[PDB]
């Protein structure tokens, strides 16, 4: 049984297929520009019966037919495919025919035949005998068990041909599986389904696993497999897949180690900065649990802790750093923490601890690591530097405590206990730190207060903050500022990270009040929340008010040319728009400008703390027949034919009526014109014409409003005295 091979540029390596009967793999003889048909006249391997994966041929010169090289090849299993091809014959110069008269069944895959300029006998081959699916083939540019010579069907575990019919030991090849001179249907136990064509015991898979001590072989699903399938861990006794150095300087250096659990080696760490630090690094690297070798961290700048190695609970130290260290730490500047030693437990089997020039990691973490690591009594002189490590972290062993907190909305008075070192000269200051934190997933220096006394002295130093967004949670903590002592240094205190919210105070202007008068009585006022919402905004306090029409418009003569008309405590009608940032308002006049005030309230029942006002102003749509004239057109014709016209006005107009228009024309004349203003209508009580032509006139009357024109009245028929 011979493996898969790629014989290249010369046929000397083809002679390694001498005693081979199964290619356990594929074959690819390619790019033989130097081979000649003389090289193929004395070249044959009829021992080969089965290839498991495929065949590929590409630019082998001199090769003319395959009937000599492999006359007795019968089955390609198609165990691996070459883009669904178990056969690719491509650009085979000199290849005139295939000649593979013993080709009987391809179990899996298709046939690619292309650019084979001499290749004939391609239509003479029934690939449907050979392929169970000939559809994906590319030829351009006794079911499967077969029969012997007299045509008797072979054994049902033969495939394609048999020396003697109906005998699994006298098959030429196996349909499914092979075991001990016999085509078997399955691999019975203890034989494992080996490479999907044969059956091997434990010791074969075992010893090849030990030779790869390469695909160290494992076992699952009655199969000697290279690697365990999904969710499975090999069992080192019986290979059973049971259910479960490198420098790191960058995120991409961790993306390779993404998903690692046990490391058969050591690691070197000099990441010095970047985005998503400790988070991508946990996502790649918290998953690791075990390390055979040591661990190096040198010069690793911008990080602060190693807690993002969540599962990392073993250093074997099998590879030691020089000096027999399983651990290294140098020039790791911003590192304040190894781990939560109350949380993360860690085993360090071999080696010691190199702790040098890492000026923010306190010795307490170090002695924690000594105790938890089990390496405590290992470290000697100058394994760990005392004066370069955590010496700039100040290690505040105590807490500062807040004595009084007052918040205003933008302002928070803190009061807290005055700390004093025992030599209270050394108190240099107090160092309050803060920031914004809507979660709890987590700077001011203040001077020392006046020592001076302590009968009952409020020398509580106090602090007011000022510019704050009100109703906002703030992660805040103080630190002492003192002096490093010339003696055993007083470590000082620091206050707790307290999460103080500013006050649900008057919120900001509720943003963008967009007032769209989508009807003659509907206006969708919509808006955004305030930029400083400053509390859980209970309702949005909408005030609106009708703005009446302007007074000068009632007393202008709009019959004058120059009539350029714009075509547009006390309790108001209001709305507490609870949990809604839009409002349509109903019950509104047609065509009347309104003034609207918006506020936002995050406080309604005790003493409404509402926003400042957001004003907007809008006019509803007109009605159509508000402007169309109601009431009759009355003519009053005098003796002197001073004709007085009368009409009821459009009582409910679209706002107001600026002028009136009358159309008079004789049978005989054309429409002449005369205007009626507001005061002209109010004074003449309609209109008044004076002395016109005989022949019958007709009168239609239009209203013209601010919104537009209210339709012409009906044609009104009358005749003055002709007097002859």
């Amino acid at each position: 049984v011979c493996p898969g091979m790629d014989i290249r540029n010369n046929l000397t390596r083809l002679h390694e297929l001498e005693n081979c009967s199964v290619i356990e793999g594929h074959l690819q003889i390619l790019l033989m520009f130097k081979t000649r048909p003389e090289d193929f006249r004395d070249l044959s391997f009829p021992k080969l019966i089965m290839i498991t994966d495929y065949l590929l041929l590409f630019r082998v010169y001199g090769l003319e037919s395959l009937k000599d090289l492999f006359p007795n090849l019968t089955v390609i299993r198609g165990s691996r495919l070459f883009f669904n091809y178990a056969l690719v014959i491509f650009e085979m110069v000199h290849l005139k025919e295939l000649g593979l008269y013993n080709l009987m069944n391809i179990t899996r895959g298709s046939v690619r035949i292309e650019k084979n300029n001499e290749l004939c006998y391609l239509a003479t081959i029934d690939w449907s005998r050979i392929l169970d699916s000939v559809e994906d083939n590319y030829i351009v540019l006794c079911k499967s068990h077969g029969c012997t010579a007299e045509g008797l069907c072979c054994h049902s575990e033969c495939l394609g041909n048999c020396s003697q019919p109906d005998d699994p030991t006298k098959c030429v090849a196996c349909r499914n599986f092979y075991l001990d001179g016999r085509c078997v249907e399955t691999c019975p136990p203890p034989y494992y389904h080996f490479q999907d064509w044969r059956c091997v015991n434990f010791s074969f898979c075992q010893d090849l696993h030990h030779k790869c001590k390469c695909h160290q072989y494992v076992i699952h699903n009655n199969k000697c497999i290279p690697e365990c399938p999904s969710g499975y861990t090999m069992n080192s006794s019986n290979l059973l897949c049971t259910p479960c150095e490198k420098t790191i300087d960058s995120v991409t250096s961790a993306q390779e180690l993404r998903g690692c659990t046990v490391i058969n080696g050591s690691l070197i760490i000099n990441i010095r900065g970047g985005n998503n630090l400790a988070a991508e690094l946990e996502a790649n690297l918290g998953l690791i649990e075990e390390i055979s070798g040591y661990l190096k961290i040198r010069r690793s700048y911008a990080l602060v802790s190693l807690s993002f190695f969540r599962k990392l609970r073993l250093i074997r130290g099998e590879t030691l750093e020089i000096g027999n260290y399983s651990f290294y730490a140098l020039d790791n500047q911003n590192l304040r923490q190894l781990w939560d030693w109350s949380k993360h437990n860690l085993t360090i089997t071999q080696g010691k601890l190199f702790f040098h020039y890492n000026p923010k990691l306190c010795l307490s973490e170090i002695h924690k690591m000594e105790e938890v690591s089990g390496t405590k009594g290992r470290q000697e002189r100058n394994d760990i530097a005392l004066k370069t490590n955590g010496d700039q972290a100040s290690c505040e062993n105590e807490l500062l405590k807040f004595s009084y907190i007052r918040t205003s909305f933008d302002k928070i008075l803190l009061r807290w206990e005055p700390y004093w070192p025992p030599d209270f000269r050394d108190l240099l200051g107090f160092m309050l730190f803060y920031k914004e934190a809507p979660y709890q997933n987590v700077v001011v220096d203040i001077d020392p207060p006046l020592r001076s006394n302590d009968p009952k002295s409020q020398n509580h130093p106090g602090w007011l903050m000022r510019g704050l967004k009100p109703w906002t949670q703030y992660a805040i903590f103080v630190k002492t500022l003192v002096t490093f002592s010339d003696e055993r240094r007083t470590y000082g205190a620091k206050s707790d990270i307290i999460y103080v919210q500013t006050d649900a105070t008057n919120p900001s202007v509720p943003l963008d009040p967009i007032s769209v008068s989508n009807s003659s009585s509907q206006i969708i006022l919509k808006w955004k929340p305030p930029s400083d919402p400053n509390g859980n905004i209970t309702h949005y306090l909408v005030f609106w008010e009708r703005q009446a029409e302007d007074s000068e418009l009632f007393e202008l003569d709009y019959c004058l040319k120059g009539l350029k008309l714009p075509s547009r405590e006390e309790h108001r009608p209001f709305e507490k728009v609870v949990n809604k940032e839009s409002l349509v308002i109903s019950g509104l006049r047609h065509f009347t400008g309104y003034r609207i005030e918006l506020q936002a309230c995050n406080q309604d029942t005790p003493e409404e703390r509402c926003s400042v006002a957001a004003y907007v102003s809008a006019r509803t749509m007109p009605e159509a027949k508000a402007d169309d004239i109601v009431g009759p057109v009355t003519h009053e014709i005098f003796e002197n034919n001073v004709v007085h016209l009368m009409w009821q006005e459009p009582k409910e107009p679209n706002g107001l009526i600026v002028l009136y228009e009358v159309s008079y024309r004789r049978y005989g004349d054309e429409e002449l014109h005369l205007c009626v203003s507001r005061k002209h209508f109010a004074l003449e009580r309609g209109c008044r014409l004076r002395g016109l032509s005989p022949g019958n006139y007709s009168v239609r009357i239009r209203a013209t409003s601010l919104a537009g024109n209210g339709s012409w009245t009906e044609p009104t028929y009358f005749y003055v005295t002709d007097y002859l």
Binding site: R406, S408, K411, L413, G462, L464, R466
Partner: peptide, 27 residues
């Protein structure tokens, strides 16, 4: 100045407390 001084009395009410404070706001 009006917002600025408005807190100063809130400040000086805390700063002085029972002491109290004299506060001239004008100009």
């Amino acid at each position: 100045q009006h917002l600025c001084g408005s807190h100063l009395v809130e400040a000086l009410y805390l700063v002085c407390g029972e002491r109290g404070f004299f506060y001239t706001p004008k100009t």
